[PDB]
Amino acid sequence: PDYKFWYTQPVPKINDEFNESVNEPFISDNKVEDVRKDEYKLPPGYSWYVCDVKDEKDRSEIYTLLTDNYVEDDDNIFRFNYSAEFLLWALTSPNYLKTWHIGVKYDASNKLIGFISAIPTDICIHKRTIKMAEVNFLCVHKTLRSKRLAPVLIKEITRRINLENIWQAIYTAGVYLPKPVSDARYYHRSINVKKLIEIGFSSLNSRLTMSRAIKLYRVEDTLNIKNMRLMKKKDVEGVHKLLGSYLEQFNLYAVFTKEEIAHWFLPIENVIYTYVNEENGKIKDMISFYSLPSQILGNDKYSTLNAAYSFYNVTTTATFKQLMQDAILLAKRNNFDVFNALEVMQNKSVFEDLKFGEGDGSLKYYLYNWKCASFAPAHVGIVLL
Ligand SMILES: CCCCCCCCCCCCCC(=O)SCCNC(=O)CCNC(=O)[C@H](O)C(C)(C)COP(=O)(O)OP(=O)(O)OC[C@H]1O[C@@H](n2cnc3c(N)ncnc32)[C@H](O)[C@@H]1OP(=O)(O)O
Ligand SMILES: O=C(c1cccc(NCc2cc(-c3ccc(Cl)cc3)c[nH]c2=O)c1)N1CCOCC1
Ligand SMILES: [Cl-]
Ligand SMILES: [Mg+2]
């Protein structure tokens, strides 16, 4: 790989190695005045479109583009199917900019063929807190792949983020790019065993028959933490303290305001699930997971796999194993087929005992315009959508 685009950007070369004495931008002393005020040029017949994610019809156009053209596994079995309600939540966090929700239309058809997004957040990297853009949902229509549209989308969102006096970004991808700050494998905990086998995801053998697999993954319908309940507005201050206190140990985390805690955790059916344990007026434990279905490609029976993804989990009255056992149970109670988690924070410590299987690859964490030491994924304290 030559990285002809990426090697023009303020990111590390593949064989760049920085030690912990280095924690700073590649390019400092940036001036909003000097940022390009012209939109990047698109190929003839294509136009920039500012998407209004709060408009049901604009949001439906993003939904359709991602449904048909977003992330697949390397074997083209699954395609991520973020819901329209999920995209509304993901993109309208506190102080979001509409103008960071960037579409490209094909003029002749008036159809959306490209998208990229960012939201603003404070990110703490090796104890330094920096205002950053969190970039996600980069997507080019399958009919227009390998035409160098992605670098146009990346340069245009970089320009718009820079106009807000923001000079760093955080992003994740399954593909290897220059250069990860950390790299986390994903693991899966089967809940609906029979469905996962029927779609070709989970395997059986002469030792693990269907009946034995169903018994292996069977869940007792009783919580270790009896009073775990859906989070309410009254719990925002307590979750801010419990989660905020927990995250300070990590080398990379979001520094959440109380308004960001309310946005990212208060529950929304089929989008975000947060449960809390309240003891003596204090929030002492929390579980959270988001809903991200996958379309099961070419399957006539099942249109989607209903997957819960581990978000943020903290325990002070139970073991981390007991807490994540309760997270699996709460996902089962909410009709999820599988519980997915990355080897970030304390997660890898429970994967063997709670019968998670290792997945087919890894999610890489990246910073834009930041040089620093890389670290093991247990020191990652942030989960992007
Ligand atoms: C200060 C503010 C800064 C803000 C910006 C921060 C950076 C944000 C960066 C974006 C974070 C996004 C986070 C997410 O959303 S990760 C999810 C990405 N989306 C998908 O995987 C959906 C399915 N695939 C697609 O839609 C396309 O394949 C995409 C759009 C991904 C590439 O389109 P296409 O396949 O038609 O290729 P091209 O000819 O246009 O372009 C080829 C160039 O693009 C580089 N490439 C390929 N994949 C990715 C990728 N996932 N991140 C970054 N760069 C990527 C590639 O190495 C090459 O450059 P180089 O190798 O020649 O050098
Ligand atoms: O095998 C997959 C799957 C589905 C789609 C894509 C991929 N691989 C690539 C990939 C991965 C992920 C990913 C997968 C799991 C987790 Cl916990 C966190 C991130 C993100 N971005 C990617 O590009 C893997 N599963 C397991 C069953 O539930 C849906 C996800
Ligand atoms: Cl350029
Ligand atoms: Mg292209």
Residue to mutate, 138, 164, 366, ligand 1, most ligand atoms under 8 Å from C-beta: 138
338 CB under 6 A from ligand 2? Answer: yes
Q: From which experimental method does this structure derive?
A: X-ray
Residue to mutate, 289, 310, 340, ligand 2, most ligand atoms under 8 Å from C-beta: 340
Establish how many alpha carbons lie within 13 A of residue 68's alpha carbon, considering only the half-sphere containing its beta carbon: 16
Token pair 């929304």: residue: 268
Whole-number Å distance, alpha carbon 72 to ligand 2 midpoint, is 8
Query: Alpha-carbon distance 260 to 282, whole Å?
Result: 19
- Measured by CA distance, the residue closest to atom 2 of ligand 1 is 158
Q: Which ligand is nearest to the CA of 172?
A: 1
71 CB under 6 A from ligand 2? Answer: yes
Query: Alpha-carbon distance 14 to 10, whole Å?
Result: 13
342 CB under 6 A from ligand 2? Answer: yes
Number of independent structural domains in the chain: 1
Phi–psi pair at 325, nearest 5 degrees: -60, -45
- Which of 316, 271, 305 has its CA nearest to residue 289? 271
Q: Is 337 exposed, middle or buried (0-12, 13-18, 19+ CB in 10 A)?
A: buried
The verdict on whether residue 5 carries a ligand-binding annotation is yes
Q: Report CA torsion sign: 170, 176, 178, 182.
A: positive
Other residues' Cβ atoms within 10 Å of the Cβ of residue 279: 12
Gaps in the chain (C–N > 2.5 Å) come after which residues?
Answer: none
- Which of 346, 224, 227 has its CA nearest to residue 283? 227
Within 8 A by CB and 6+ apart from 315, the residues are 225, 285, 322, 323
HEC readout, 172-235: EECCCCCCCCEEEEEEEEECCHHHHHHCCCCCCCCCCCHHHHHHHCCCCCCCCCCCCEECCHHH
Q: Which residues share a beta bridge with 229?
A: 276
Using only the alpha carbons of the chain, give its radius of gyration: 21
Residue 208: give the domain boundaries: 1-385
Supply the CATH number for residue 250's domain: 3.40.630.170
- Which of 135, 22, 15 has its CA nearest to residue 370? 22
Query: b/e per residue, 292-307, with b = 16+ CB within 10 A?
Result: bbbbbeeeeeeeebbb
Within 8 A by CB and 6+ apart from 234, the residues are none
Pocket of ligand 1 (CB under 6 A): 1, 3-6, 69-71, 133, 135-140, 145-151, 154, 157-158, 161, 166-169, 171, 173, 175, 177, 368-369
The verdict on whether residue 300 carries a ligand-binding annotation is yes
Query: Alpha-carbon distance 100 to 189, whole Å?
Result: 35
As separate numbers, helices (DSSP H) first and strands (DSSP E) second, the chain gives 9, 19
The one-letter amino acid at 270: N
Q: Which ligand is nearest to the CA of 36?
A: 3
Within 8 A by CB and 6+ apart from 276, the residues are 228, 229, 231, 235, 238, 239, 283, 285, 286
- Classify residue 26 by its DSSP letter: S
112 CB under 6 A from ligand 2? Answer: no
The verdict on whether residue 144 carries a ligand-binding annotation is yes
**In 75-199, which residue ranges form alpha helices assigned H by DSSP?**
84-91, 149-162, 193-198
